[PDB]
Design a protein around this nucleic acid. Structure first.
Ligand code: ZN
Length: 273
DNA sequence: AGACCCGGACG
DNA sequence: CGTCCGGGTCTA
């Protein structure tokens, strides 16, 4: 899940939990719990708190409780659902928050990569994992100037640059490849090689792509669904991601796939330079 | 780049 | 049944 997927989950999850009070927290894979590292303290502190809000920062969900914020990262496969305490759990359910009304917030994660950190609200933004995060791409804090400043300082690939959460928040493998295609820039280009015009174009396409994907409920390419289990539709608007061997939608040249920055990387060798 | 982790898709 | 694949990304 990237920004659009996490944002769609945020919007669809909030009404199902807002105003509910935690009665128990049950943990079946303690490694997911990162702070307090003692899962017993993590569970104990949340009991009796009420969910007041749910925000997103980058790819993180921020559950606003009473004293605390719970910072949750889904990583590759994490997901939330709300269901009755009376029903058996689904496979791969690793954390459950039980509410006083008999419903439960269930966290499922087949690969177990997800993380949870709880801090006092006023502390969460200055501690890991939120502390190092770059600007929200849909905010004024993300500008061509901000992008140029990081690009000029490094010979790392432009793909690696956009995947760096400290540069800009919320971009992952799908939206980096898509933004680079739309901007006409090869993903293996050294970041420092980008012209002023290319930086401007890249910023414009990054903002447009993310916004469009939010509007379309995210990209369901393998396993992502919203809180109601509904697939996104942005996958129908992809130019390159997962389209290797298929014709480019713009020029008909077969899309190629390589490895860049240790990641599967999709591009059109004609449209991108 | 490796680790954390698992199951699907493909030969 | 084995091999490679994956919307993330921390540390090594
Ligand atoms: Zn093309």
């Amino acid at each position: 899940p990237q920004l659009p997927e996490v944002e769609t989950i945020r919007r669809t999850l909030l009404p199902l939990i807002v105003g509910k009070t935690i009665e128990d927290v049950r943990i079946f894979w303690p490694n997911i719990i990162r702070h307090p590292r003692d899962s017993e303290a993590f569970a104990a502190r949340m009991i009796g708190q009420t969910v007041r809000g749910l925000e997103r920062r980058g790819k993180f969900l921020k559950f606003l409780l009473d004293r605390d914020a719970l910072i949750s990262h889904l990583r590759m496969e994490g997901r939330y659902a709300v269901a009755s305490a009376l029903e058996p759990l689904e496979p791969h359910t690793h954390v459950v928050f039980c509410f006083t009304d008999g419903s439960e917030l269930r966290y499922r994660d087949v690969r177990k990569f997800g993380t949870m950190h709880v801090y006092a609200k006023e502390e969460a933004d200055r501690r890991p994992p939120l502390a190092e995060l770059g600007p929200e791409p849909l905010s004024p804090a993300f500008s061509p100037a901000v992008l140029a400043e990081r690009a000029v300082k490094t010979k790392r690939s432009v793909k690696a640059l956009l995947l760096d959460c400290t540069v800009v928040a919320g971009f992952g493998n799908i939206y980096v490849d898509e933004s680079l295609f739309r901007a006409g820039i090869l993903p293996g280009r050294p970041a420092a090689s980008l012209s002023s015009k290319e930086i401007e174009r890249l910023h414009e396409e990054m903002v447009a792509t993310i916004g469009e994907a939010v509007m379309k409920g995210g990209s369901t390419v393998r396993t992502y669904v919203n809180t109601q289990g509904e697939a996104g539709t942005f996958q129908h608007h992809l130019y390159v991601y997962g389209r290797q061997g298929n014709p480019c939608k713009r020029c008909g040249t077969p899309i190629e796939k390589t490895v860049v920055a240790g990641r599967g990387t999709h591009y059109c060798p004609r449209c991108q330079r």
